[PDB]
Structure formats: C-alpha cells, structure tokens
Design a protein around this ligand. Structure first.
Ligand SMILES: Cc1cn([C@H]2C[C@H](O)[C@@H](CO)O2)c(=O)[nH]c1=O
Ligand SMILES: Cc1cn([C@H]2C[C@H](O)[C@@H](CO)O2)c(=O)[nH]c1=O
Ligand SMILES: Cc1cn([C@H]2C[C@H](O)[C@@H](CO)O2)c(=O)[nH]c1=O
Ligand SMILES: Cc1cn([C@H]2C[C@H](O)[C@@H](CO)O2)c(=O)[nH]c1=O
Ligand SMILES: Cc1cn([C@H]2C[C@H](O)[C@@H](CO)O2)c(=O)[nH]c1=O
Ligand SMILES: [K+]
Lengths: 250, 245, 250, 250, 250, 250
C-alpha cells in the first residue's frame, strides 16, 4: 500500500483513471458483475474497493460509506493514486409529490446541508457536479429511458434531524431545520441525500470530475412502504445506468 | 402599467416564455439583429426591451443592467409576465491561462459572492443553471464551433474589490477578498461576472430554467489590452434559445 | 478617458470633487436644470453624467441606477476622477404610517440588507452617512419648509423578496425575510431603498464623505400604491434640498 | 424598587427625560458638580446615580460601568423610568496618529464588535447616534474650544484581544481579530471604545435618542504616554462638552 | 502599579495563584470574611479585590461585576499576577422545572450567547470548565449537603433580551432570541447567567483552570421572582460551597 | 427490524442501556473478548453490534463508522433501543508535543469543526462530555496507571484538510483551516478525531450521558512518527480503560 485508509498501490490502479463510488460496500460487487475480470482489492472499515474492466479498460469501484467524512477520505486517496473521475450512485428518499417511488434522479448541484463541504470550499462555492459526468448520466438514461428529472439535491449530515425525521428518541428538531422539509419543496429540491455535496465541492474545487445518480426508495410525502424486496431490481436499474455512463467517457 | 419598473404588458409578450437577458441597454436591439421582426415595447430606465419572433414564436430580449439587484428586478417581473426561460449573455474576466481572448465561457454554477441570491435561497443552496439550458449552451457554442470551455464562475457583488482590483482609489481590499483571487485559482473558477449568482439562484429556487453564457474581453492573468474595438456570444444565444424554443 | 464604465476623463470635471448620484438617468438632466451651464458628458450604460457649475465651482451629477453594484461602480469611478464627496438623491417607499406621500427623507445610517457593502467592510462596520453631508441636508430640509424625517433606513439587495412583497410569481418569501419588515417596523426604521448602505460603506470605509436624501412616492403599509405620477414634484423638494445642501460643501 | 440592578426609581429622577451615562462609578459626582442642585441617589455595583438639573430642567447622571451588558441593563431600566435621551461620556484610546493626545472624540457610529448589540438588533442594523444628539456634541466641542474629531469608533467587547493587544498573558490573538487594528485605522476608525455600540443600536433599536462623546487618553501609534496624573483633565475638558451638549439638548 | 484596571501590585497577593471571582463588589468581602487574616487590597471601579489565607495559604477574592466584558479584564489582569484558577460564584436563573429555589447549579460548559468569548476562540470552540476544577465544585457542594445539579448553562450578554424577558420597555425580544428559552429547556440547559461562557472560554483557551458554581434565586419557568431571605440565606450556603471548593484546589 | 441501518432489536440488548461505540467494525470483537459472555449481535453496513455482560449487567459494543453522519445515525438508533450511555473509543492524532506516543486521551469537551452537530444544537451550545461518564473514565485511567491527559479535542468533518494535511492531489486547503492547527496548538487542544463533537453535542442536547476516551496512534507535531505495524499500543491499552469505565457507570 501507498495510502493509509484505502490500502492500495499505484499498481493496483491497473492504469485506471476513473472510479465508481457507491455508499454501500455490498453493492460494489453488484457493479462488478457487469464488468470484465472482476478482482477485489480490499474491504476495511466502511471502505471496500474492487477492480474490473470496462470495454476491457481499467476501472475501480470503491465504497464511500455513510456521509461526507467517510466519502471525503476515499475520494481524496483515489485521487492520490490517482483517479480524475468519480461516480456516486446513492440510495435516496424524494421529497417532491409529483415524483413516484422507484425513480432515478440526476443531480446538477447539491444543497450544502453538510459540514464536510466547508473543508474544501467556503459555503458560497456551489456543490456542483461536472458537466461531462452530468451529461453522461442522462445520456446513459437516454438509452434506458429511466424516469429522470432535472433538479437540485439536498445533502444533509444527519439522517433524522436534517431530513426532518421525527419518529426519534428526542422527537425534536433545531430551528435551522424547523420547516426545512417544505422549504426545499417549494424550492424545487427533489430529494435528501448525505454524500453528494461533499463530493461535488471536493471535485469542482480540486480540479476533479464527478456525477450524481440516485434511486428512489420512497417518497417522503407518500405513505406506503416501498415495495420491497421486489422493487430492488430497479436498484440495478440505476446500477445499469451508472455503469453505462462510464462508457462515453473513454 | 402592469408592473412599476419594466412598463411591459401582457400583449408585449405575445405569449413569449423565453427572454434573453444581456447587461447593456444598448445591445438589446443588437441581439435582435439575428432575430426576426424587431419591435420596441418599453425602454424605461435601465431596461430596454425589443419584441421579436424566433421560428414564428414570441421571444423577448430585456437588459438586466448592471448588478444582481437590478437583474433580479428584470427576471422577476419578466416572469410575472409569463416567462420561465432566461438566457444571460455578457462579457467576463478570465482566470485561466489556457483561456484566451475571443473564447466563450459557459457557467455550470456560480460562486455566490453576491447577497441578492440570499433573498431567494440561503447560502447553503447552490447556484446552478438548468441542464436543459446548459446542454443547449454547450451545444450552441459547438454548433458555432468556437473555442469553448465549461466550468464554474464567481459572481461578485462589486466590480473592483470583489474581483480583487488594486488599481482603485484606495488600493486596499478586505481580508476576505485579500488574496481571494489567488485562492480562486485552485478552485478552478474560469470567469468573473456580476449577474449570474442572483439569476441562477432565483431561477433554481422558483422552478425556473435559466442559462448562462459569456465571452472574454480580458484575462485577469493576462496583462494585455484587447485589439482595438472590432475584435459569437450573441449568435450562440439565439441558437441556444432556438433549441429550447 | 481614464475609466471604463463611465468612459470619462478628469478634465471633464474641470476640477470638480463633488458628485450627485441618482438612480434614474433621465432625472440627471432634470437635476442639472437646477444647476447652470449644464454640459452633457456621456451616456454609457446606466452611468449618465453631466457637467455643471454652482457658485463658480464645477459640479457633477452622475447616475448610478438601482442596486449597490451599479452604485459601487460609479461611486468608485467618480473617486479616482475624482470626487471626494457623494450625495445621493432617490425615490423610496417608507414602512412607517406617519410618513405620508410627498415626504423628504434623510438617513443617518443604513441597514446592510445588501451584499455589495460587504466588499468594503465586514458586517460589523456600520454604513453611516458623513456628518458634514448629513447636517447640510438637515439644514437644507428645514429651510424650504419641507417635511423632514431623520433616522435609520433599510437597504435591501432585492426589490420584491427583500422588502417583503409577497405578491410575486412564487408567492413565497425565504425564511430570513419571512417576517423581516415586522422587525424593522418596530425598530423605527424609516424607509425602503436599495442603494444607501452600499454607498455609505464604501465611503465611510475609504475615507469619503457621503450624503443621502430620497423622496416618498408610496407607503408600504398603506394599502394603496398612490396614483402613478402626478405630484411627485416632491422630487423638486428632494432635489432642491440636495442642491442647497450641495452648495455648502463645495 | 422597580429596577433590579440600578436600585432606584423615578422618584429620585425626578421628572427627568434625559440621562447622562458615563462608564465610571467614581466620576459621576464630578459631572454633577457642573449641574444645578446635585443630589446623590444610590451606588450599586456598576451603577452610580446622581440627581441634578441643567438650565432648569432635570438631568440624570448614572454610570453604566464597563461593558455592553452593564450598559444594556442601565438603558432598559433608565428608559423604563424613563429616559428618551442617553448621553455617554468616556475615555478612549486613539488609533489615528493624525489625532493628537488631549483631544475629544464624538462618535457618529460604532463597529459592533460587541455581543450585546445582537440582543437588540441583527448585525445588519447599524449602530448610529441620533442626528440631534450628535450635532450638539459637535457644537459643544466647538463651543468649549476642544479639538474635535467626529467619526466612527470601534466598539470591542474585550480590552486586550478585542482591541488587538498581544500583551495578553497568553500573548496571542484570535484569528478573527488578528490584524484587525491596522485594518480599522485605514478604514478611518478613530479610536477604541467598549460600550457605545450596545447603547447605539438598542437606542436606535428601541426607540430612543443617543449621543456619544469621549476623551482621548492614549494613542496606539504615538509612543508618548499621557502624563501622570492630571493629563486626565482631558476627561474634564470633555465633561465641559457633555453638559454643554445636554444644555442644548433639552 | 501594577496593572491598568485592578491597580494591584503583585506582592499584594502574597504569591496567591487562585482567585474566587463573584460579581457583586460589596458582596465580595462576605466571602473573604470566612478566611483567616481578611485584608482589603483595593477598590477601583467595580473591582474590590481582597487577599486572604486558606489553610494559611494565600488566596484572592475579586469582583467581576456584570457581563463578560467587565469580567474579561479582571481574569486577564489577574493572570499576570500568577493566578491560574478562577472560581466564579453568583446568582442564576434556572430554566428547568425540576430545579427549584435553594438548589445550587454547577456548570460544566456554557451555551455561548456572549460576545466576549469570541475574542479568545471561535464559535466552534467550547466554553468548558476544567475537569479537576469541576469535580471539586460539586465535590464541595455535596459535602455541604446542598441540592445540586450538573449540566449546561446558557450565558447571555444581556440581562433581559438574551434571557427572553418579556416585560420590557418596548416589550420585544429580537428575532434570534424569540423562543430560545424553550429551546434550551428542551435541550437540557440548567440555568441563565451572564459571565461564565467568557470566563470558561478564555481559561480553557488561555490554558487556565476555571470553575462555575451558582445559587438559584429564581427559576425562569418558575412564575416567581427571588424572595429574601431564602435567596440571600442560600447565598452563604453557596458561599460556603465555593469557599470549601477553594480549599481543595487551594 | 425496528431500526433501519443497524437492524437491531431491543431483545438483542437484553436490557443493556450502556454502549461502547468505536468506529471500526472489526475491532468490536476484541472489546467484547475482554468482557464476559461475548455475543455477536448483528453485522450490517458499517455497523456491527455486539452484546456482552460486565458486573452482571448487560453491556453493548456497536460500531459507528467514520465521521459524524454515521455516528449520528448509530447513536440515534442505539438510543431508540434504547441506550442512554455512550462510551466512545477511537484512535487520534496528537497535536501537543508533551502528549507522547502511547498516551490515553480523555476529552471533557470538543471543538466543533464538524457539521452534523449543528443539526442538534446551534454552534453556541458546547460539545461537552457528561461529567459522570468523564469522571468514571478519568478515574478508570487512574485505576490502571496509564499515561493520561485531560483536556479539549478537535473534531473535523474531513480527515485531511481539517487536520492540516498537505500532501493531497491539489495540496491545498481552504483558508478557514490555514494554520488552524497552530491555533489549537496555542489554545491548548489535545488531539484530532472525527466523531466526538457529534456524540457530545448529540447527547447533551438530547440529552443523555456520553463519554470519550481515545488513544495516541500518531503525533504529527513531534518529529517522531509512529511505528509500523500494530505498534499502536494504546488502542488496546485505552479500551482497557474504557471497559474499566464501562464497568463503573453501571
Ligand atoms: C434511505 C436513506 C438513505 N440516506 C443516505 C444514508 C447514506 O449515507 C446514503 C447512502 O448512499 O444515503 C438518506 O440520506 N436518506 C434516506 O432516506
Ligand atoms: C471589463 C470587465 C467587465 N465585467 C463585467 C462587469 C459588468 O457586469 C460589466 C461591465 O462592462 O462587465 C467583468 O466581469 N470583468 C471585466 O474585466
Ligand atoms: C418605490 C420604492 C423604491 N424602492 C427603492 C428602489 C430604488 O432603487 C430606490 C431608490 O433609489 O428605492 C424601494 O425599495 N421600495 C419602494 O417602494
Ligand atoms: C485606556 C482605555 C480605556 N478604554 C475604555 C474602556 C473602559 O470603558 C474605560 C476604562 O475602564 O475606558 C478603552 O476602550 N481603551 C483604552 O485604551
Ligand atoms: C491516522 C489518524 C486516524 N484518525 C482517526 C480518523 C478515523 O476516525 C480513524 C480511522 O482512521 O482514526 C485521526 O483522527 N487522526 C489520524 O491521524
Ligand atoms: K444597475
């Protein structure tokens, strides 16, 4: 290894310059099944990394974990290697009523409701995804025809207070997030995620490229529990897109 | 009138839902030079408007004037009229050596140095331009085929200090902005302009689509004066407007 | 020419170090009708300036336009030329009931609800009008029997959201300003304008003299926006008052 | 005893609509020694209240002590009594070498480097003295013949680090104030004081007239220290001014 | 001789390195009366410093007065003299219903509603008391047999607005502080005080030892207002605590 | 399941109300291996929970992961179970030269350079550890006889910028974190970790007991770098103190 947290070498890159970065470690493999010569690298703490070929060209897939902090570490060290491109592919809950459950969302920029973004750029700097990577997502959805909309995504640090989830121990929410739910709704914000803003701020301001795709588990306005575990084939429907987006980048 | 500042009416629009927004009152008619049938409707104060048609459909061009505040006035009222699309064209100051004079820059998002944006959405909210608009903009600059680069733009609320200019009467700059342009170098900001941050935040936070495009008459790193006053950005706009039209 | 936006040279001032700054360019020539030997200089963009003389000395009246940015440019640009004293005439709407239509308003300092002011000084540094500029206005407001109000005024970055006008496309006002005029009302703030705080800050922090005067055309609280144009000769009051005040500093 | 901290009532006021409010418990009597019918009232903690009259009308001289918080309670409780006009006399440290030792300073506005001001006004609201109270201070300093400088005075919440003195026992300065002092003088800040901003905003905030004047004690730049022990006649020189301004202000 | 404000020369403390710092100047001595060889040191402004012997070893008692600003100077000017431990005792306002009059409250760390603290360390930096100093406070309070609670205290910069006192001259509380007491109460905050946070912040950031113990004369949720002598009786009950607390730290 | 991320049930607790929560999933085993009846509970995502018994009482060791957001979720879910006591143990970086390699760190309060803590309490609120947990933790270190330090801890959202690390791709960090380590160097902060301020704030706000103990696995400041490869003795030596403290809070 050359690097502390990832535990990988420059030779482990395999010549690759691009990395796909999902949040769940056990879904890194799900991506690797759609690629050639799947080779594992390491799985420590939250971070699980994999090696595979796309069109036979080298590409790495590594797990970020939960939140900016965990994400901030991997994205940095992959770039240490280094990568020039990152792909997010996170699971999310939508806050817009007109959007249905199980839809795929491309994000242009992210609301900095996190604190991890401030480490790379001041609050004024927009958490915006790279145009090349952004285009790729819709262009990958162009082939599939997935439900997709254009809009902004909220990126909170906390699961419960930040997204305004009340069935909790405290049952309390600070003034900042008091009425935050519809605050983003009338703003046109599509969903609540936790990893985007950090990544996007980390990339745009460090001369790096990144895109953002998300699969809806549930609409926060709607009442019915997601149709699990049948609808999970649609989780691959976002997976098949993010994979396809890596072609057209070569 | 319907509104207190523009002086436009519902008839003036002709069901127009797209508006081009430059910064110069004197270049509004200059934009209609590639458009069809110009006719003037109201030219009050900073805002000069010329009704025209593109492909048989109503289009308007209205100057924002200089600054976020004045721009917000245009966009809001134009929208009240019934416009949801806004394409801004102007000139900027480049920060990158690979960018030359004569090259057009397109903005993905704005560094919100301004304060008018805060009236639409808090600092945490990003200042992004519409992807449908952005696609057209990039696919118009290549449709022209001029040297074009895409990235982030810093939108100051002031011309001199906010863009770190020391040639001024004082020659001093606040700490936040003292050496900030150098800080902006590594952040990867292409250009400086003064209207986007308010424009993009007010549109993204109201469910409105807006595009941003600009040419370069000066590079901040470049210590050179532009060739004299005859030496794309406008033709692109109409073409960019054509796509979503 | 020396500058860029105004496109003028110092010689055009003929040794003038005083400038009047309105928003409306068409008013500029109307203002210079109260001074003598008026000479037009240029109308590049908003920034319409004019050459006049009062009491033997040269006087300049240059337009800025709505918004601090516009103000900041001209006021900066007039300085290197260069004016050292700045008096602003404007058109405003008050939030206090006792202020009726046809009132002349003078401000001691301004609420920094803007962002342009922040480029000259932190949010702590007050945007205060210079005493020599303030007293002359008051001394002039009392003479011609004009209705005078002295105090603090709010300076919004935006016209519609900032001054709390809900009758707009969206029909919503952001949290920060949702209930903002409720506060200013009880603070004793006089009137709503857009250019005062910025001008004062850049002058008080750069060692310059700044005056501020405006005319009432509408009341925010009072149900009715008054009949569009009839009586606002009040501008004459507002312009007469600033003219007599301007003569003194010379 | 309506008040909790002052230990007083109107009954001791008595019938006064003006309050002179220095920041030194000891000096209160010496101020009242220039006032007709001087009557001691009470001395509790920071507060030291005397009753007297000037030109036939009642005047209140009560010490606020050191600090905004100490000032703030005094204002609330006096105005409860209540004063509409508050006049503070003080001693300050000059940061401008262009200002000479032994002069008098009249403050139009104060940089709110305190925390108490935030309790009465958002940071955007300026800390400005009323036009009437400020003009008489100007006139009085002329009327007595003291060298007058009028302007803006930085109002810190601490004596050592807030006014940029590395002579702290630790010998360090917080980042927010590191290099702040040389940052203020170029902006035109005349001196350093500690209580005006609190008085200025809340009075401007609460509905009341306020004036500020203070005696110069020492210069930050000038290496000449005030002579012991009666170079503090500068306060007495300024004391001539506070009463004379009060003599016109009622 | 030897510092500016206190006016104390260092031998006058007899090498003492710990100082009890109550806020009431004429209430300072009743604490110092329990220690052997009670000696007045001096009385400048609000500060009445006493020197005493604990275990026959020298200890100091100084007045802070009202507010962080005035408190900051004392602790600071006490620091050059060799004092590195400061134990603050005063009257506070509880906001939790379960805490009733006669109960003394020890504070571990404080909600910094102050301004003075910000001059030593950023808002990110906690206003926390020393562990060894804090154990002792309750370690003595229990010995006395006092009803004592342990937790967090909100520390305002103003008596009234910051503690959301409603019946005031204008009867208004600022937008920032509208309903803050309810926030702190639900957040688990014990009491209200004006001086700890600044004392806590500096000493924690200056590398000093700091303790906070206070007697409740009033609870805020409590519709009541402190009634002598139960309040005043409990003061000695708290004096005995902080005095006994002083012996351990010496 | 009842919760979402952990997938735990209150029966798996078996009436446990206390929890040791290190970030790493792998280590958790060893923490329970020194406890009695080591029972693995569930192992999903980054969150591996275990159930143990010490002193006859039910105890729990669950992994939180890296950074605030995940830490917020785990503590939230665990508290819903519900745990009421949280003993955080992790690795860290020494910023004080005197704090040597192999030293145990006890934290009273933490510097909030994180963003998740803003979601439970405004930045004014201190990220302070509960005294009961602290004392138990401190006295545990006392019982063992291991090098220990008591103090303040910094908590960044991000691993590299927030802790002043240069060797990254760009090699740059935002101005906010410029020489910020030197700030803490002088202010007296002890170490660098990524999780505490969330926990401390979360619990105190919530509010509930929590504790933090940690171990030196690096000193950036001292010339000495830590050895490879399992040299970080403290991690096992520090958990001995926390499991000792775990045995005491019951
Ligand atoms: C299910 C869900 C996940 N997330 C976040 C938690 C994880 O960090 C991230 C997984 O990519 O998505 C939310 O923010 N809200 C949600 O409703
Ligand atoms: C000359 C110049 C103008 N501008 C903008 C600011 C104004 O909006 C407008 C003035 O011509 O152009 C820049 O942003 N950078 C520059 O270098
Ligand atoms: C009429 C009116 C003007 N204004 C501002 C707009 C102008 O730019 C400013 C005068 O320069 O007054 C308000 O803020 N509110 C109003 O009601
Ligand atoms: C000597 C001096 C006093 N002061 C003020 C603070 C106090 O209010 C008073 C001295 O106690 O004068 C300053 O602000 N700066 C100074 O240099
Ligand atoms: C090496 C190192 C790790 N850590 C922490 C961060 C993570 O929580 C954990 C795993 O690296 O250790 C530090 O805080 N500072 C350091 O220098
Ligand atoms: K303008």
């Amino acid at each position: 290894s050359d690097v502390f947290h990832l535990g990988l070498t420059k030779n482990d890159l395999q010549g690759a310059q691009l990395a796909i970065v999902p949040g769940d470690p056990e879904r890194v493999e799900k991506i690797a099944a759609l690629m050639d010569k799947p080779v594992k690298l390491a799985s420590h703490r939250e971070f699980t990394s994999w090696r595979a070929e796309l069109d036979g060209k080298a590409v790495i897939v590594c797990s970020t974990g939960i939140g900016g902090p965990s994400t901030s570490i991997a994205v940095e060290e992959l770039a240490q290697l280094g990568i020039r491109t990152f792909l997010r592919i996170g699971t999310t809950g939508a806050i817009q009523p007109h959007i249905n459950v199980g839809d795929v969302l491309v994000t242009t920029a992210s609301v900095r409701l996190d604190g991890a973004s401030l480490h790379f750029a001041p609050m004024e700097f927009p958490a915006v995804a790279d145009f090349a990577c952004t285009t790729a997502l819709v262009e990958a959805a162009k082939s599939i025809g997935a439900t997709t909309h254009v809009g902004v995504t909220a990126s909170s640090d906390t699961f419960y207070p930040g997204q305004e989830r009340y069935d909790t121990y405290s049952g309390r929410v600070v003034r900042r997030f008091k009425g935050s739910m519809e605050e983003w709704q009338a703003m046109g914000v599509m969903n609540y995620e936790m990893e985007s803003a950090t990544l996007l701020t980390m990339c745009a301001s460090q001369g790096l490229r990144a895109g953002m795709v998300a699969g809806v588990i549930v609409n926060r306005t709607q009442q019915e529990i997601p149709n699990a575990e049948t609808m999970k084939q649609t989780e691959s429907h976002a997976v098949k897109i993010v994979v396809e987006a890596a072609r057209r980048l070569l």
